[PDB]
Design a protein around this ligand. Sequence first.
Ligand SMILES: *[B]([O])([O])[C]([C]C1=[C][C]=[C][C]=[C]1)[N]C(=O)[C]([C]C1=[C][C]=[C][C]=[C]1)[N]C(=O)C1=[C]N=[C][C]=N1
Ligand SMILES: *[B]([O])([O])[C]([C]C1=[C][C]=[C][C]=[C]1)[N]C(=O)[C]([C]C1=[C][C]=[C][C]=[C]1)[N]C(=O)C1=[C]N=[C][C]=N1
Ligand SMILES: Nc1ncnc2c1ncn2[C@@H]1O[C@H](COP(=O)(O)OP(=O)(O)OP(O)(O)=S)[C@@H](O)[C@H]1O
Ligand SMILES: Nc1ncnc2c1ncn2[C@@H]1O[C@H](COP(=O)(O)OP(=O)(O)OP(O)(O)=S)[C@@H](O)[C@H]1O
Lengths: 392, 537, 304
Amino acid sequence: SDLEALRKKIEEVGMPEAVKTKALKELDRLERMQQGSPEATVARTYLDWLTEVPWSKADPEVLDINHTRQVLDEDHYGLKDVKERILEYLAVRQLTQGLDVRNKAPILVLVGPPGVGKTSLGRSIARSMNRKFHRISLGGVRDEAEIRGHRRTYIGAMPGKLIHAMKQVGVINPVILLDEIDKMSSDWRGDPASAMLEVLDPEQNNTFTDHYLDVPYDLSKVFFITTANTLQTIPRPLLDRMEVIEIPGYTNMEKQAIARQYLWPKQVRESGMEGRIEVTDAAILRVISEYTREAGVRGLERELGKIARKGAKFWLEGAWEGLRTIDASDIPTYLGIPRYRPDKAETEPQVGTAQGLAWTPVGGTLLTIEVAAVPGSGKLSLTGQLGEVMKE
Amino acid sequence: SDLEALRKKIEEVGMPEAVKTKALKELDRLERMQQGSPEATVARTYLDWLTEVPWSKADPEVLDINHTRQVLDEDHYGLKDVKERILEYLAVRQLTQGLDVRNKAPILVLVGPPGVGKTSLGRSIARSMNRKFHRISLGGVRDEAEIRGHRRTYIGAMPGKLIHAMKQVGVINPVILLDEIDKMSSDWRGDPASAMLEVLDPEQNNTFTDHYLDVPYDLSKVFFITTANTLQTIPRPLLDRMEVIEIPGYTNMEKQAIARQYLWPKQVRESGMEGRIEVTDAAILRVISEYTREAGVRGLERELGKIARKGAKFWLEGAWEGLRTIDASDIPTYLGIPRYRPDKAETEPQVGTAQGLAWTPVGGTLLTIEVAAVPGSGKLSLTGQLGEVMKESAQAALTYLRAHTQDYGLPEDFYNKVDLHVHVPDGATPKDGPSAGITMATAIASALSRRPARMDIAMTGEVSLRGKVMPIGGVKEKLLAAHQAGIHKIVLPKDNEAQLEELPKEVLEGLEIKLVEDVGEVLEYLLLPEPTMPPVV
Amino acid sequence: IPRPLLDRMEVIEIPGYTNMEKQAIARQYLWPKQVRESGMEGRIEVTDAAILRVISEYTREAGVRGLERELGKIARKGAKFWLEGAWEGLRTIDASDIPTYLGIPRYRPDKAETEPQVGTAQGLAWTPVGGTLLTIEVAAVPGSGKLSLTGQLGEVMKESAQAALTYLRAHTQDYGLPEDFYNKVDLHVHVPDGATPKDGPSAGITMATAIASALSRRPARMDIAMTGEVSLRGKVMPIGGVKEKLLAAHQAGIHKIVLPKDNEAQLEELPKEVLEGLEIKLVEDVGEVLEYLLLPEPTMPPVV
Ligand SMILES: *[B]([O])([O])[C]([C]C1=[C][C]=[C][C]=[C]1)[N]C(=O)[C]([C]C1=[C][C]=[C][C]=[C]1)[N]C(=O)C1=[C]N=[C][C]=N1
Ligand SMILES: *[B]([O])([O])[C]([C]C1=[C][C]=[C][C]=[C]1)[N]C(=O)[C]([C]C1=[C][C]=[C][C]=[C]1)[N]C(=O)C1=[C]N=[C][C]=N1
Ligand SMILES: Nc1ncnc2c1ncn2[C@@H]1O[C@H](COP(=O)(O)OP(=O)(O)OP(O)(O)=S)[C@@H](O)[C@H]1O
Ligand SMILES: Nc1ncnc2c1ncn2[C@@H]1O[C@H](COP(=O)(O)OP(=O)(O)OP(O)(O)=S)[C@@H](O)[C@H]1O
C-alpha cells in the first residue's frame, strides 16, 4: 500500500517528463522483487533521493531593493561593490515578468585577504534576498565523490554533497555557499576541483548528472557564492567560469567604523555589559595601530574581547556608577604591552638612503632602502633577504 | 502472459544473430523461473536492458548541406574549420551507398584555451543534422563503475555510462559529447583512461564488450566529440585514436563581431532590456582591448552583463526614452576603471632598443628589448626574468657580432672592454622562447654601435650562430598584436612566409612584411645609417 | 606489467615503421581502404611524392594512424570538391597539390646544405619517431679561452664537446690550428634549433669536425654527414641507432656517410636498396675524419 501512496508522491512532485517515466519504470520494477530481497533497498532509497530532492519549487524572492538594501546595510559595513552586484541582480529580474524570470544566477567568487568578512556574506545575503541557504564545507575536499556520490550499485550509495545541499534546502534556488574553493587538489586521490567544471558551467549547468542518480538535475537557478583567499591556485578553467569580485581589505578609517558600528557593540552585548563600559573613538586607533597587523578585522575584535572580558573582572570585583570610558591612555593596562610598533617616517636629507613603498595583503608598509658605497673593486652585493626579481 | 510481449519485443528491435539466440535462451531460462526472486530480477532487467538499447535503429543522413551549413552559422561565428569538418562528413554520406559508415571516420577532439566554444558545440552539431544529442561529463571521473559497467550479479548493477547513453538516446548514431576528456584521473585504481582505449578505437569499437550488456555492442556509427583544453595530460595511446582539431582562440576582429551578433543580444534579453540600451561597435573594442585579458568569450560576456545589469539598475532609479547609446566616453562609468593597458608602439628611432613580438595563448604582446653598453670587462648580464632558452639565444647573437665586428661598424675589441646588459621590460612576468633572436641582434648592435634602431619596424625571428635566420612559430597572433598597436612594417624569416595566409586579408594590405633569410639584411634594414651618439670612448 | 606476468612471456617488440615502409604501406593498404570508405569509387589517385610529402611533412609519429588520417582529409576534401565540380576520369594528386587539400604544412623538411662552410657539419640524431638532421655551428672569436655551449645541450654532450677540444689541444701541429688558441680564442658551439633539448655523446666526431674547421678557418664539406663518439687519444667509438640515422640522411639527399669502424655490423639491417645509394666510409681514428672532411686550403683569414 506504500508504493501506490509513493506513486501519488511521484504523481505530483516535479517533474521532468521523461524522467517521470525513467522514475516510474523503476517503481514498476519494484512491483515485483518482493520487499525483502536486498536490491529492493537500492531501488527504494533511490526513489527517496529521487523524490525528496526538490523539482519545480522556487521560493518567492523579495523584490524591493530599498528594503533589501538596508537589510544588507544592517550587518556589513562598506563592501559597496558587493552589495551592488546583488542590487543589480534584483533590479534585473524585477524588470522581468512573465517570460524569463529565473534564467541564471551569476556565480560569484569573492577573493580577499583572510580577516575580512567573506563567509559572512552568504549568511547575510540569504536573509537579504529571502532565500534558503546551506554552506558547503569545501576546505580540503580531495575526493571526486563529495560532488558526485558513488554509483548506486556500491554499498554506501549516497549522492554528492551538492545534492544533499539541494535536499536540506527545500527550494530549487538557494544561495549555496562554497568555502575556500581553492583548497581543492589536482593530484592522486581524485581531483574534485575538476568535477566543479561540470557544476559551475553556466550555459551547461542545467544538465548536471550525479552518479548516484542517473537523471539530469537542474542547477540553472541556484545562486552560487564562492570564497577564496587567493586566486593564484585556482585551475585556469574554473576561474574563467566564476565572476571575480575583489574583496579589498579595510583601511583604518573603515576599520574604525566597523569597530564603532558593529564590532565593539557586538562584543559588549555578548559580555554582560549593556553599556556599563565604553571605548572612545580616539582610543580605537591604538588597538588598530599598536595591536593589529592583519588585513580585515577578525584579528581586531579579539582585542575588544579582552577589553570586554577585563571589564567583567573589574566589574565583578566591584561595580561602578554607570559607564567608564576607556581612553587612549588606558589600553596598555588592558591589552598589555603594544605588540606592533607604528612605523615612523624619517626627517632630514640623508646620504645614500631613500624612502620606499611596499605593499602586501596585510596592507601598506613603509621601507627605507639603504645603500652604502665603499672603496674597492667592482662588486655589488644585495642583502636583506631580497627575492630574485628585485635583484634584477 | 506479460512476458510474451517482451518475447515479441525481442524479435522486433535489431537484432544481431548470436545475441538473439543468446536472448531467447535467457528468456526461455527466465520464463521457467517463477515470478520474482533474487534470480528473476537480476535476469529480467537484463532483458529489459537488452530490449531498450537501440539496435540498428538510426537517423537519416541529410544530403542537403546548404541547410546544415545555414544552421551552424546561426550558432557560432568563426570556427570555419570545424564547420568544414562536418560538411565534408555529410558530403561523404551523400556520395556513399552500400559500404561502411564510420570505418575510420571522424572521432573528433577539440582543443583550445578555455573561453572558446567547444562544449557549446555538441548541441549545435547535433541540431545541424538532427542527431539526438547527449552529454557525458568526464572531468574528474576516476573509476570503472563508468564505461565498463559492473557485472550483472552484484547486489546493484548498471551498465557503463556509454551504454546508459544509448539507452537514454533513442538511436544507434547519436552525437555523444565526451566533455572534458583531458581530466581523466590516473590516481592508481584503474583509470578509465584505459577504459576508453576500447571505445574510441576507430577499428575495434564495433565489438565493445560491456560487463552488463556482455554481448558485443557496436558503437561504430556513433559520432564522438570530446572537448579538452590541453594535450599533455591525455595518455599517448588514447590521444592517437582521436583526431586533434585546434581552436586557436579569437582575434580582436572576431571577439568584436562575435559580440555584436551573438554575445550582446543574448545579454540584452536576459537583462530584461529589449532595446532600451544599445552599445556602439567601437565602444566594444574598448571593452575587448582594456577590460579583457583572455582568448575566448566566457570572460567577455561577463562584461557586457555588468553593462546590462548597470544598464537596468539605472532604469529603476530613473527611466528614460529611446535607445540610450554607449560610447567609449561612457564605458568607464558602467564597467569600471581601465584594468589593462593598450601597449602603444613606441616610434622615434631609439638607440639600444628594438620592438619585439611575443606570443601567448591569450594573444600577442608587443615587447621592447632594451640593451645598455657601458665600460667594463665584457660581463654579459641578462635580466628581466629571462628563461634559460632565451639567455642562450642572446649569447648566440652576441657571439655572432663578435665574429663580424668590422662589418656593422662595431668597436674592434668591445668584447674585452664593455659590460653589456640586456633588459626586457617588464620585470615581473617571466619570458622564454628563442624567437627573440633577431630582436636582440639588432639592439645589441644598436647599443655597441651608436646607430639608433628604428622602432617603426617590429621584427621577430630565431637567429643561428652562423647568421642564418631560423623560422619561428605563431606568426599570426604576433602580427595581429602588431597591427593593433599600429605598426605597419614587419621583419620576418623566409621560412615563415608560408604562414601568412592565416591573417585576415584586410590586415595583410596594411603590412609591409619583409622576408629575410640572414641577419645581415636586418641590421642594414633596421639600424639608421649614420650614428648619432658618441661611443663608449 | 607485473614481473610474474612479464617473465613468463616472449617479449617481441615492434619497432615503429620506417618512411620507406610508409610510402609502401600507404599505397598498398591504407590508401585503397581510405578511398573506398570515403565513397570516392576511384575518382582520385595519389602519387609517390604526393604520399611522400604526407609521410614526412604532415606526420611526426612512427605509426600508420597518423598517416592514415591525412588520407582521410585527402579523401573528404577530395569529395567535397566533387559535389562542387565533376571531372572526366580522375585527377592524380601530385606533390604540389597536397597543400591545396591538406592545407599549410606542419613540420617542414630539412634540406641538406650545400657549399662547404666554415665550422659546420651535418650531424645525425634520432628520436623515437625517426632520425633527424642536425647541423653544428661553432664560432672562433679572439677572447679569453671561454667555452660556451648553447642550444640546450644535455650534460653528456657538453662533456663530449670538451673531449674533442681536448684532443685538438693535444695534436695542434698535425692540423692547421693556431698554437695558443686555448687561452686566446673563445669557442662557442651552437646546435639549432634553440628550443629542442639535445642529449647523447654519439655526436663526437661531428663536433671535432666543426671545431677543427673553425680554428683552422678551413671550410668543411656539408655533403658528408658524420656521427660517432670521440675519445681523448682519438679512438672513434661505436654508436647505436644507425638504421634510424642513415635512413634520415638518405631522404635529405645525403649520399656520403662517415661511420665508426665498429659499426660495420649494423649495416646488415639497412635495406639493401638504400646501401648502394650511400657511400659509407668506415673510420677508426678521428684523424681519418678530419682529413676526409676538411678542404686543404682555408678561406677565412686566421683569428689573430
Ligand atoms: B618566441 O620564442 O616565439 C618568443 C620569445 C620572446 C619574445 C618576445 C619577448 C620575450 C621572449 N616566445 C614567446 O612569445 C614567449 C612564450 C613562448 C615561449 C617559448 C615557446 C613558445 C612560446 N613569450 C613570453 O615569454 C612572454 C612573456 N610575457 C608575456 C608574454 N609572453
Ligand atoms: B647520439 O647519442 O646517438 C645522439 C646524440 C646527438 C648528438 C648531436 C645532435 C643530436 C643528438 N643521440 C641522439 O640523437 C639523441 C638520443 C640519445 C641521447 C643520448 C644518448 C643516446 C641517445 N637524440 C636527441 O638528442 C634528439 C633527437 N631528435 C631531436 C632532438 N634531439
Ligand atoms: N564590513 C564589515 N563590517 C563589519 N564586520 C565585518 C565586515 N566584513 C567582515 N566583518 C566581520 O568579519 C567576520 C567574518 O569573517 P570571515 O568571512 O569568517 O573571514 P573570511 O576571511 O571571510 O573567511 P576565511 O578567509 O576562510 S578565514 C564577522 O565577524 C563579520 O562581522
Ligand atoms: N561563436 C561562438 N564561439 C565561441 N563561444 C561562443 C560563441 N557564441 C557563443 N559562445 C558562448 O561562449 C561560451 C563558449 O564556452 P564553452 O565551450 O561553453 O566552454 P568551453 O569552451 O568548453 O571551455 P571549457 O573547456 O569547458 S572551461 C559559451 O557560453 C557559448 O554559449
